[PDB]
Design a protein around this nucleic acid. Structure first.
Ligand code: MG
Ligand code: MG
Lengths: 117, 1180, 117
RNA sequence: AAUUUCUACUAAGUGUAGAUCGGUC
């Protein structure tokens, strides 16, 4: 019963983390849904939890294309995002905006999403 | 031409424009560094303390005058009062003598002992510094030196206290009409109780402990009443009636506790004394304080619940007391005492009129409308319905005292149920965890408690007559006056809590700014130039208020004229308004004897005075031409306004240094991104300085400047975000969402500071066409062949209803005002207020707090009636015709309409106020009807009781019998078909001419004489031909629709009678059972029902009459409900407004009979008989 | 360190709960702010952590008046709701839909909001 | 849901349509 709370407490912590990322994904889907296809930011795509308050800019698996075509995922009602145009088929569901063109990205881009429009 | 062209510039009307001033440049920095708004906020903070000190000096002045005053005429007022009056106008000398008492005591006020240094500036300069010997308060009074203007409303309020006006705020009405009457009543009760009590309890104990100077009995004589004219005499005298602490813990009792102590005959058999009222001069800030008042006032131990215990004990002994003299006041509540004991609202009225026709009415009843009027005023005049008189008005085995006793004990049982549900609120430890403006269930409890106790207050205060009555029972009224004033205290607690919870979350508290000057912006740019230190600059299309400073006031008027750029055009050319009292001082510092002898109030000496006024003057601009119209031309041509230039960078440097303050006069209509139609006051302020304004709208002195702080915090701002859709609320709008590029904050204008500028103006200061309005309206309506009338109806399924009729009686136009059409750039959007109000009432039905909902409904109705005021003014400008708004004074009640009485009072007040000076906003201000030549077609507002029968272009009509009448024939129901007995059922049937069945039309023809029916004097034709046509909705609310002829065939085939013969009346009178006559009177009553409505769902609503016209065709409103131009009313409400409009056409018909100098005395008030003659004859 | 995990684990559980209530508040705000002021649902309102998954319809502190005027909180960008008209000043920040009029109420009307449009 | 101030609003994008005075208690 000692090491049971290791995985129980880690399960609860990862649950709070993935719910924080889901709330930020809902808000970020609302603002990027409001943007008219040309003020869209360079953005990091993922299909995993990506924790923007603890984002580590050292992994070589990050790219910075311009997002477009925000739409629904209507069998579970989640946000989904296309990383390029419609005819590229790389639909992702965990995005984090970033400053800069690819191969390096600067820090966060916090609270400047509404400032882009 | 029209009639309204002769109604320009008749009299004068003053207005007050309101604007927003915002600082420009570094003026907010100079105000913040020079600390100017720290001397004015603390000055407005210390206003209440100086009010308390002036109340203390006024109380000391009252206790210095009234002490050394003896009286003479008091004994003749006391002795002749209780003489059981012997009216040959001998008690009129008592009344004029009472006027001599008022003029005696307020002659003692106004006459001597100062009174001239009492309402002026020196009362805070000399007397009150020497008086209140204390630096703290004396430093406050010296810190109000020089500003002796903020007290003039206080001084005008306190000067009405020392006068003869017989008002409840005056002191003479307090001492004479309130204290002396209970003093006489206590002398008579003392003479009834007058015996040796125990010969130690009054003369030995009370005299030695209390005063030890003289005796007790002399308090119940005439001249020692002077001794109770102070406050300490009232304190000693009520201390002897009530009790006194003896400056120890002895706690001696009074005389009423001795009457309780006597214990004679298990009734106590004796009246009790009344304590006298005091002199004239004797939390709504948090949440824990209001609940603490609710702790200490209304709990299970205070004076209020104990007074409910004593009033509840008083109505349990309500049988032992003699009911000979217990008076119930005639008013509204007497109807309630008929309803909750007897059958209906009008039962005691029928028994008293049965006493009235027992004397004043003979056989062969000649009952007209005027005998009913004298009977009605004779019922209005009594005011003294006792309980024995109501006992004689009852049937067998119906005790009024027992039914009233059980129902008032039922009401205090309801109070114990509300106190049963309210235990856990003030028990011991309630911490209100929400706000009090949010914790809804607590408010619901306090609301229910204060409403049950205040409703018991009204139903118990029905037992107070007019007073000054006959030998009224003092054994009942001795206890019932001691306990009622506590219940007046719960009336004030109700008003305080209700005035706490309905507060808006922002505030409008402000304070006047002087800028170190007790002369600040009095006039507008006179030759003073350094005391007023304020003027108006203009630049482009923005306006500015320039305020100088005391260090650089006089040296600021050195500014150059026309520069190369930047000219602030300043105002100049001041005014000398009404220069008549300035005029002869130039001339009189043959014609001199003419002026000093006063013979001018003349023609030739007037003309020599014209040439004398022209010759003896020629920096002024005068142009001269009996004496009254000539001084009208002096005041006319003593006005001129023009502008003078300046430089921009000079006064900008004056702003940057600190030698000048500038504010911007600016509202929403002065904005650059503003494209629509402006407000009206924007057109006043922009036409205040316009070129072709010859003097219609001119400035007035006394403009003020306020400063409002911020009441909302930044923590509680709320705002629709930018670049996101938000939904619209008007369901008649073809768009459903909107999206803006910016934010929209809720209550943005109450989160910052704001400068406010109040600028008074004056309209038509010099009238030109002066004539009486009413008589000229009657002359113009006499000499016109084709008038028009607007008929405005309060409505039942509507809110207002409009029917416009012509001079002959043909409906020109008819439409409802449920929805308002707004106009902008050709686009028209409707807004439906009836569904809006239905949604607000649906929200009120589920709120658990109906305190905020009723206030929102009242504010909604105020906005609605302002929109209706616009629509009525466009209708008057269109057809050019008088209004016929129903006279809201005849007492007529209805209780089914939506627009209630108070809202419609406000509507008629807004029509009078708008038609004082009526402006078409979208017109040229130089033509008629514009902003400078507005129409003046209604006199001022005086009171709601002066709304009677005439005001300019407005006629008040006593709506009587206009709702339920046939607009085609003129038939009205004058019968009374309620089933009460079988004998009057047979006489009802005996009165009928001939009840026959026609088979060719399948109808039950009721041809019928009225002359065997009572109260039929108002009718004209007297021979009517009724039928059973159509079907009627039987209301009960079960909504049972009933057809007519199948019901009479259902009742005649039943009970074994026939209907195929002729003259079946007698065969209808051959029955014996009760239910045939009961259901037959029911079918007669549904046959006479003319207005048919569901009153639930709004499917059908119609109006059908059983009488055929002179063409055979019946009237049914459903034939006219779907037409493009109906010639008759379409529903029940167009009938009402149509008939009211025909009443105005009757009065215009009465103007064509009299002569041109007799039109002023022509009576407009139509009776019932003349309206039924005009409605039954003048159709065709 | 034995009963320290009592308050730490309860702090984590209440943190995940209040983040669930924030996520449901954000999604519910978007769905209600889509509706045209007459298809809005009757709403239980509160100013405390309201749980739509563990709501107990037994306390006498619950009403059911119809919501309106969905807007933002300016400084904290939270969602606020008005439970009557605007001119009643009853702004609340924790709402939950329920089928029915006041007092005697039915369920909670789950995922039936989008069907109102 | 923006206002000199009030009421309904969103009415073509920092506003739209009407009403509106006084200083009081
Ligand atoms: Mg406008
Ligand atoms: Mg509003």
């Amino acid at each position: 019963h000692n090491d049971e709370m290791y995985l129980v407490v880690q399960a609860l912590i990862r649950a709070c983390i993935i719910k924080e990322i889901d709330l930020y994904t809902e808000q970020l889907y609302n603002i990027i849904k409001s943007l008219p296809y040309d003020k869209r930011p360079n953005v990091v795509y993922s299909d995993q939890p990506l924790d923007p308050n603890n984002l580590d800019l050292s992994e070589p698996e990050l790219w910075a294309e311009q997002v477009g075509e925000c739409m629904r995922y209507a069998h579970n009602d989640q946000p989904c995002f296309y990383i390029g145009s419609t005819k590229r088929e790389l639909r992702v569901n965990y995005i984090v905006p970033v400053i800069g063109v690819r191969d390096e990205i600067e820090r966060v881009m916090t609270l400047e999403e509404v400032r882009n429009l | 031409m029209s009639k309204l062209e002769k109604f320009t510039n008749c009299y004068s009307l003053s207005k007050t424009l309101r604007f927003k001033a915002i600082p420009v440049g570094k003026t907010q920095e100079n105000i913040d560094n020079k600390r100017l708004l720290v001397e004015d906020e603390k000055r407005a903070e210390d206003y209440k303390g100086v009010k308390k000190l002036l109340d203390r000096y006024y109380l000391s002045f009252i206790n210095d005058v009234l002490h050394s005053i003896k009286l003479k005429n008091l004994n003749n007022y006391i002795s002749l009062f209780r003489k059981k009056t012997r009216t040959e106008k001998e008690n009129k000398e008592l009344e004029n003598l009472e006027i001599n008492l008022r003029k005696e005591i307020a002659k003692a006020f106004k006459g001597n002992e100062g009174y001239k240094s009492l309402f002026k500036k020196d009362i805070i300069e000399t007397i009150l510094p020497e008086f209140l010997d204390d630096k703290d308060e004396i430093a406050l009074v010296n810190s109000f030196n020089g500003f002796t203007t903020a007290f003039t409303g206080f001084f005008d309020n306190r000067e009405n206290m020392f006068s003869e006006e017989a008002k409840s705020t005056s002191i003479a009405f307090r001492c004479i009409n309130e204290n002396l009457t209970r003093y006489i009543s206590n002398m008579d009760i003392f003479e009834k109780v007058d015996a040796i009590f125990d010969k130690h309890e009054v003369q030995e104990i009370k005299e030695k402990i209390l005063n030890s100077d003289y005796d007790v009995e002399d308090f119940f004589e005439g001249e020692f009443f002077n001794f109770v004219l102070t406050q300490e005499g009232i304190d000693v005298y009520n201390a002897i009636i009530g009790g006194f602490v003896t400056e120890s813990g002895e706690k001696i009792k009074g005389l009423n506790e001795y009457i309780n102590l006597y214990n004679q005959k298990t009734k106590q058999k004796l009246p009790k004394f009344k304590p006298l009222y005091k002199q004239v001069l004797s939390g709504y800030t948090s949440d824990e304080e209001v609940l603490e008042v609710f702790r200490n006032t209304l709990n299970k131990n205070s004076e209020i619940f104990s007074s409910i215990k004593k009033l509840e004990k008083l109505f349990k002994n309500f049988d032992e007391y003699s009911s000979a003299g217990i008076f119930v006041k005639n008013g509204p509540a007497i109807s309630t005492i008929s309803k909750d004991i007897f059958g209906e609202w009008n039962v005691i009225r029928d028994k008293w009129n049965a006493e009235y026709d027992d004397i004043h009415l003979k056989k062969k009843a000649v009952v007209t409308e005027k005998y009913e009027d004298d009977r009605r005023k004779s019922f209005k005049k009594i005011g003294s319905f006792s309980l024995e008189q109501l006992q004689e008005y009852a049937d067998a085995d119906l005790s009024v005292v027992e039914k009233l006793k059980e129902i008032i004990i039922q009401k205090v049982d309801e109070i114990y149920k509300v106190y049963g549900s309210s235990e856990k609120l003030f028990d011991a430890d309630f911490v209100l965890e929400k706000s009090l403006k949010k914790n809804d269930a607590v408010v619901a409890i306090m609301k229910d408690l204060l409403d049950s106790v205040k409703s018991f207050e009204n139903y118990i205060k029905a037992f107070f007559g007019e007073g000054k009555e006959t030998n009224r029972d003092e054994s009942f009224y001795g206890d019932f006056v001691l306990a009622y004033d506590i219940l007046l205290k719960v009336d004030h607690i109700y008003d305080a809590i209700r005035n706490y919870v309905t507060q808006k979350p922002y505030s409008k508290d402000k304070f006047k700014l002087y800028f170190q000057n007790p002369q600040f912006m009095g006039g507008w740019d006179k030759d003073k130039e350094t005391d007023y230190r304020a003027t108006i600059l203009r630049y482009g299309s923005k306006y500015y208020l320039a305020i100088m400073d005391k260090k650089y006031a006089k040296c600021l008027q050195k500014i150059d004229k026309d520069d190369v750029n930047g000219n602030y055009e300043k105002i100049n050319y001041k005014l000398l308004p009404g220069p008549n009292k300035m005029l002869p001082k130039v001339f009189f510092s043959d014609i001199q004897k003419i002026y000093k002898n006063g013979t001018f109030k003349n023609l030739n000496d007037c003309h020599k005075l014209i040439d004398f006024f022209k010759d003896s003057i020629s920096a002024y601009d005068f142009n001269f031409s009996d004496i009254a119209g000539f001084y009208r031309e002096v005041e006319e041509q003593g006005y001129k306004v023009s502008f003078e230039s300046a430089s921009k960078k000079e006064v900008d440097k004056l702003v940057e240094e600190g030698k000048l303050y500038m504010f911007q006069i600016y509202n929403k209509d002065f904005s650059d991104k503003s494209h629509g139609t402006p407000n009206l006051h924007t057109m006043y302020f922009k036409l205040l300085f316009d070129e072709n304004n010859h003097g219609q709208i001119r400035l007035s002195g006394g403009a003020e400047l306020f400063m409002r702080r911020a009441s909302l915090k930044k923590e509680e701002l709320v705002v629709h975000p930018a670049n996101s859709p938000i939904a619209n609320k008007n369901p008649d709008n073809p768009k459903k969402t909107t999206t803006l590029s910016y934010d929209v904050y809720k209550d943005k204008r109450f989160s910052e500071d704001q400068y406010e500028l109040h600028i008074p103006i004056a309209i038509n200061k010099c009238p030109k066409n002066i004539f009486k309005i009413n008589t000229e309206v009657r002359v113009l309506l006499k000499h016109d062949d084709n008038p028009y009338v607007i008929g405005i109806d309060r409505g039942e399924r509507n809110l207002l209803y409009i029917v416009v009729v012509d001079g002959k009686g043909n409906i020109v136009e008819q439409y409802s005002l449920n929805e308002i059409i707004n106009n902008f750039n050709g686009i028209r959007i409707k807004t439906d207020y009836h569904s809006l109000l239905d949604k607000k009432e649906k929200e009120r039905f589920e709120a658990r707090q109906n305190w905020t909902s009723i206030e929102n409904i009242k504010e909604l109705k105020a906005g609605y009636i302002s929109q209706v005021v616009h629509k009525i003014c466009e209708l008057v400008e269109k057809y050019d015709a008088v209004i016929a708004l129903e006279d809201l004074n005849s007492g007529f009640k209805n209780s089914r309409v939506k627009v209630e009485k108070q809202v419609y009072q406000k509507f008629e007040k807004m029509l009078i106020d708008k038609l004082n000076y009526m402006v078409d906003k979208k017109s040229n201000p130089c033509a008629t009807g514009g902003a400078l030549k507005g129409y003046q077609i209604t006199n001022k507002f005086e009171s709601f009781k002066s709304m009677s029968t005439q005001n300019g272009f407005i006629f008040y009509i006593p709506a009587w019998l206009t709702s339920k009448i046939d607009p085609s024939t003129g038939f009205v129901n004058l019968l009374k078909t309620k089933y009460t007995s079988i004998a009057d059922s047979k006489k009802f049937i005996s009165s009928f001419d001939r009840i026959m069945y026609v088979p060719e039309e399948d109808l039950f023809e009721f041809a019928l004489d009225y002359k065997n029916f009572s109260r039929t004097d108002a009718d004209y034709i007297k021979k009517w031909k009724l039928y059973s046509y159509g079907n009627r909705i039987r209301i009960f609310f079960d909504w049972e629709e009933v057809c007519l002829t199948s019901a009479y065939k259902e009742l005649f085939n039943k009970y074994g009678i026939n209907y195929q013969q002729g003259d079946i009346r007698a065969l209808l009178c051959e029955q014996s059972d009760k239910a045939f006559y009961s259901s037959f009177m029911a079918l007669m009553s549904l046959m006479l029902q003319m207005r048919n409505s569901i009153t639930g769902r709004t499917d059908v609503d119609f109006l059908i009459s059983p009488v055929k016209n002179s063409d055979g065709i019946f009237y049914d409103s459903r034939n006219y409900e779907a037409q493009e131009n109906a010639i008759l009313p379409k529903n029940a409400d167009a009938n009402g407004a149509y008939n009211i409009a025909r009443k105005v056409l009757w009065a215009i018909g009465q103007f064509k009979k009299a002569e041109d100098e007799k039109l002023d005395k022509v009576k407009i008030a139509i009776s019932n008989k003349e309206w039924l003659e005009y409605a039954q004859t003048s159709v065709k």
